[model samples]
Target chain A: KETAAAKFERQHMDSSTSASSNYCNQMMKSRNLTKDRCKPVNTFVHESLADVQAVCSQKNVACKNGQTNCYQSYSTMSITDCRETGSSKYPNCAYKTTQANKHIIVACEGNPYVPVHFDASV
Target chain B: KETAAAKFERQHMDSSTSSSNYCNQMMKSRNLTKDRCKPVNTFVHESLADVQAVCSQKNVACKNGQTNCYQSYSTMSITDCRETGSSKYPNCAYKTTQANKHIIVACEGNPYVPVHFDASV
Candidate 1:
């Protein structure tokens, strides 16, 4: 069950305002901790990344928290500009517009692999 | 904040063993709830998939749980074979290896839309 704090954050936090919140939302959304079928939102079996998309707003969204971008590790997938049409990490990591100027980073802790950050201007 | 059951799952769960376990591990690992540092493993802010890789073992990872190839949706990124060079989506959604044979899917919720599963191969 989600805590009240989570509910509070969901109700008040807007991705267009905070990157961390947006990231948190992305995580929650990715995990299926929250839904958008109605107003209150419902928690279901956390959907796979293959089931969600990163909001363009989150990337450039202004934030009082002083964060615009947040990263999470899954597997063989990270942030991207050309994101796949669908596989799990699409829209979020698949197709990207910011790629023209921003750079994407990838990392792997299990393999002790260093994070991979590269320009996405293609 | 994590529970004991979570600990139990981490201790005995192996991604390469089960698709679900692997997915669970990927989630736990992603949340930074589990660590590879010390044997005891520390749980921090789950690292992003960019920090991890779809183990060839996982795609083919055999499992009694009847699961395989887990998926997660974040911001504008999803799973990809071309993977970005460094963005958070790379490797995870950047590089292309399995794309040579499999399909990738992308979707959204806040917008209330249908799931997007397309061919990556």
Candidate 2:
């Protein structure tokens, strides 16, 4: 069975996207997040796993669910935001890519804490 | 004001916010909905009546391919709120962006008024 950490990696982690405008449209589908409805909005972090894992020990912050196990990255990371268009529909998910530099945030779990969920970026 | 028009006004209209960080502060201040942090939201800096008037402007297409949408005649000052990952329920934080553009909104009811926010350009 795939773990939460494994699933998170499959969904959000992507450093090999390079510079593709179709990144979101392609990734959202292949990653299986857009199986039903287009994920209205999602983000892809273009950083090494170790670098992102290191963020778990950075700045503590609250998550959307009121969880207090989230952490904000100390340095800005390269990321891309994929916002589905108003006309995008299932079986043909589309997206608009937005590049930005942000302090990535993630929720960690377990004894040797590792990022299990993406929390925010600012 | 038991109407979608009133609800739209309360949530979207704010005619005088000319600074950064306004989105993050005002969104949490007004407390739109305390359930979860919204990822993308926008505030319109226009009068309620003017924003309402868009219903009669021109028919357009909404994100979901609905036809209840209309475009604004005048360019308005607007702010787009983008949630940061650190944002949590009730404490929703955002990164605000200043944009001057004609906005689009979906309308309905007997006396037509904006019931849903649609797009901007």
Candidate 3:
């Protein structure tokens, strides 16, 4: 099992996501985030893992899920959102890439308070 | 130039230019059309080169001006504010249109590939 911190990287991080239009199709599978069924939507923040980790201390906010450990980024970050296409299928999932500049909110954990989950990107 | 504000920096990537209304309102709202409606203004919605990625792609002639300019590998989305001709100062008027095409931009700094929008073709 992956640590929540590691899971954050596996599911929400990718810098090379800009190279191909089929980025989602490949990344979702390569990272094994998609299994038998296509993930409807997923996101990738194109910044260093360190920068994102720092988000844990930016500004506190309540998560939509009713959590109090969430923190929002101080600045807008360049991000790519991948959405499964209508024709997409499992094992060979395909996605449309949508990019935006958004201030992200992430959930944190641990004594030092590091990011563990991607709460929302707005 | 924060790359000097690129003019293109803030001028580009405006996803909120809806109302699909007139550019005069949109452009002026963004402070672009200003006291006098700008004859032409463009807004882009691509990720910073997210576009910054293009600076490493094709090195081409700047449509407006530059040797430090480059072209994007993808067709980016944008909106153009064109003066309605009847446009006047204080209360400018314009026609806004959308486009998806190859974009060219000027680059600067140690790693800022975009400081200006050269063209939308």
Candidate 4:
């Protein structure tokens, strides 16, 4: 059985999408993210797993919480933002799609070999 | 602040990771579950550093229009833990799954530690 840590990736991780007009509505629901309530904002990555994992050792940065364990990726990455729009409600949440390329930062743990938390993006 | 518990719900709650016994094992291992089975939760697979970088992404209003919410700049691996009708204390049955998504999380504290699990995009 996969760990919860591993399961999260399968359910939420996405690297490639057209970012079409209805991407958010289709994805948010297809991903089963709308089962309980409306999710306000979320992200989708467009890089390989190895590349995303390598960000931990890319560049050093101070975390929003003031931790020194965070690192930033030197390269700009492909990502998508899904934000709720208008007076959305449960079972009818709406979202807006926004795309950008930016560096990322994350927290390292468990042998300083793996990323455990997504601290911020700088 | 919208209370830590409320923040956690918006940022960390997940309902679709894996739909099997895997969910049960992780809920216990991650400490999110204990005497009570949490309805749902998320566990990120990246290092702690990557998770923290979200604050620098985009300063978007949270679910309630709070400007403290942050988004990620890439896709990441995560696990979603969902509770089952058969779930109970000491035997939390759940469906665990893997996800590739852009996550939105709430930040707090001076130095900053992700206190709430937002949403997966």
Best by lDDT: 2
RMSD of each: 21.3, 19.0, 16.9, 21.1
lDDT of 1 by residue, B1-121 (tens): 5343233223222222112233323333333232321112211122323213221222321233323432322222222222233424221322222111232223223332112322222
Q: Stretches of candidate 3 above 4 Å error? A: A16-19, B1-121
lDDT of 4 by residue, A68-111 (tens): 86766556677777889887788898899887786667666554
Interface RMSD of each: 12.5, 17.3, 11.2, 12.6
Cα error of candidate 3 at position A18, Å:
6.5
- Highest TM-score against the true fold, candidate: 2
Each model's lDDT comes to: 0.26, 0.78, 0.72, 0.67
* Model 3, residue B32: C-alpha shift (Å): 26
The candidates' DockQ values read: 0.05, 0.01, 0.02, 0.02
Docking quality tier of model 1: incorrect
Error of 3 at B65 (Å): 55
Between prediction 2 and prediction 4, which has the larger TM-score? 2
lDDT tens digits by residue: candidate 3, B14-114: 42225466455446434565556667877776555357787887899776645778888888887777877677776677788988888887877776657
For candidate 1, the per-residue lDDT at B74 reads 24
TM-score on alpha carbons, each prediction: 0.17, 0.49, 0.48, 0.45
Better of 1 and 3 by TM-score: 3
lDDT tens digits by residue: candidate 3, A69-97 = 88777567788888988887776788997
Model 2 over residues A13-60: C-alpha lDDT tens digits?
Answer: 887754377878888888887987787888889987766775665556
